[PDB]
Amino acid sequence: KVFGRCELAAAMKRHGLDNYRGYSLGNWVCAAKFESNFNTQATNRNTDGSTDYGILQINSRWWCNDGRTPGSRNLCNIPCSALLSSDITASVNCAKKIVSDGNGMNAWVAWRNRCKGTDVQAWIRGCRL
């Protein structure tokens, strides 16, 4: 599923991401925009052999099991395919764990390089929230 901008904002808010660990909703929408272009089915292989999955490009090196990342962890206790569903629940619950691990949203390279420090509220402009 490719979410609309405000559609994703509403889903993220319902699932408790607005201000989670102090990160306003616009930060999360911006991260999803540049990680996946709002496409739940996005997958990208990393040089180390891990793969990033879903709207927030969550990495199999630590967070989910894909059966093909030797020596990796599965800290969200989910198959990586669960991060590709049209229902964003699994991605949100796992993102909450990632952002709580100590480094905040810096875990998302696209957030650090393209969202951090910017006017992220623009990503929720016009949305009925």
Ligand SMILES: [Cl-]
């Ligand atoms: Cl579409």
Ligand SMILES: [Cl-]
């Ligand atoms: Cl559409």
Ligand SMILES: [Cl-]
């Ligand atoms: Cl929309």
Ligand SMILES: [Cl-]
């Ligand atoms: Cl859009």
Ligand SMILES: [Cl-]
């Ligand atoms: Cl719309």
Ligand SMILES: [Cl-]
């Ligand atoms: Cl957009």
Ligand SMILES: [Cl-]
């Ligand atoms: Cl846009």
Ligand SMILES: [Cl-]
């Ligand atoms: Cl594995």
Ligand SMILES: [Cl-]
């Ligand atoms: Cl933080």
Ligand SMILES: [Cl-]
């Ligand atoms: Cl990234």
Ligand code: NA
């Ligand atoms: Na894994």
Ligand SMILES: [Ru+3]
């Ligand atoms: Ru469309």
Ligand SMILES: [Ru+3]
């Ligand atoms: Ru729209």
Ligand SMILES: [Ru+3]
């Ligand atoms: Ru758009």
